[PDB]
Design a protein around this ligand. Structure first.
Ligand SMILES: [Cu+2]
Ligand SMILES: [Cu+2]
Length: 184
């Protein structure tokens, strides 16, 4: 999850290096084209400029394509890993609550891992959405709904899991304070 974000930044940089690379040989080609067009007419010259401007435009388009694709796949993998990570954490938490006798510290640790999984998912979804919002405001307004509902779910699923803590008030009391630190 943090392995794939180290795997995301990597692929992200390779993509940049790759782009900046193709972009450099285009400006390079542009030059020899300018020197070679040294003895050609103006018309053929005004057209050599358009050719390379369109060439650069195409490169930019592709880089943008690769980025979006990379991010999409990234969102898919992470969403799968985070849900999986949450489920397992929710299980250990519930199992902890049903312990006989219930162990406060153990319940908390399990609860902590769970809150962090939910918080990780929320923060992750928020960060990526805010990225698009900052870069492409109009695009962000498209996925806006699909993104807020997601956050609404995570929030409700966590609060619902937190309240399970009241089925064992003695434990809830003994760790209430530490739980607050967690939620802040
Ligand atoms: Cu570029
Ligand atoms: Cu991410």
């Amino acid at each position: 999850d943090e392995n794939e974000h180290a795997h995301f930044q990597k692929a992200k940089e390779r993509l940049e290096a790759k782009h900046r690379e193709r972009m450099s040989q285009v400006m390079r080609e542009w030059e020899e084209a300018e020197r070679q067009a040294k003895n050609l007419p103006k018309a053929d010259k005004k057209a050599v400029i358009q050719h390379f401007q369109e060439k650069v435009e195409s490169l930019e388009q592709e880089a943008a394509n690769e980025r979006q694709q990379l991010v999409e796949t990234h969102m898919a993998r992470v969403e799968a890993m985070l849900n999986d990570r949450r489920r397992l954490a929710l299980e250990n938490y519930i199992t902890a609550l049903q312990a006989v006798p219930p162990r406060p510290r153990h319940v908390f640790n399990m609860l902590k891992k769970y809150v962090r999984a939910e918080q990780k998912d929320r923060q992750h979804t928020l960060k990526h959405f805010e990225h698009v919002r900052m870069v492409d405001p109009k695009k962000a307004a498209q996925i806006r709904s699909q993104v807020m509902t997601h956050l609404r779910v995570i929030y409700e699923r966590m609060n619902q899991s937190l309240s399970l803590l009241y089925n064992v008030p003695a434990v809830a009391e003994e760790i209430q304070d530490e739980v607050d630190e967690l939620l802040q």
